[PDB]
Amino acid sequence: PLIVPYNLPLPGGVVPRMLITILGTVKPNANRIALDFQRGNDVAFHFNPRFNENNRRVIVCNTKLDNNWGREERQSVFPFESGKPFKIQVLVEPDHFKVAVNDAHLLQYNHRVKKLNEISKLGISGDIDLTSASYTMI
């Protein structure tokens, strides 16, 4: 393992056909996980599984601009389980990030931040044991 929080540099930012893979295990009494694709202080793409928001499991996605959170996009499809190994795959496409978990499509998130080549860090945090974080071009 690596110990969270972990920052993965994305040198020169991201580009369509770039596949980011995050392997780890959800901790047994997990409350939250976050991935933060950052352009400086802005968060181009925040991907935030919540295990107990009002006693429901929900995925919240958003963007932070000038330290202000925007409109949330929410999904009840929730593929994570406390205590289990996971794989998150974020595929950069021309108009969106595509997310699959454990080889099943989960969601798309339209690019609000347009300068993909300045989204130069991925922060990984929350209630996981982190096994690896890496990228390849498909």
Ligand X SMILES: CO[C@@H]1[C@@H](n2cc(-c3ccc(Cl)c(F)c3F)nn2)[C@@H](O)[C@@H](CO)O[C@@H]1Cc1cc(C2(C)COC2)no1
Residues of this chain that interact with ligand X (CB under 6 A) are: 32-34, 46, 48, 60, 62, 69, 72, 125-126
Q: How many residues does the chain have?
A: 138
Nearer to ligand X by Cβ, of 22 and 33: the residue is: 33
**Which residue positions form the known binding site for a beta-D-galactoside?**
69-75
Nearer to ligand X by Cβ, of 2 and 15: the residue is: 2
Based on its alpha-carbon atoms, the radius of gyration of the chain, rounded to whole angstroms, reads 14
Q: Report, in Å, the least distance between residue 84 CB and ligand X.
A: 17
Q: Report, in Å, the least distance between residue 137 CB and ligand X.
A: 28
For every residue of 52-74, DSSP letters joined together read EETTEEEEEEEEEETTEE---EE
Nearer to ligand X by Cβ, of 60 and 100: the residue is: 60
Q: Report, in Å, the least distance between residue 138 CB and ligand X.
A: 28
**Which residue positions form the known binding site?**
69-75
Q: In whole angstroms, give the CA distance from residue 57 to residue 76.
A: 7
Question: 121: Cβ–Cβ under 8 A, 6 or more apart, which residues?
Answer: 7, 8, 9, 10, 37, 38
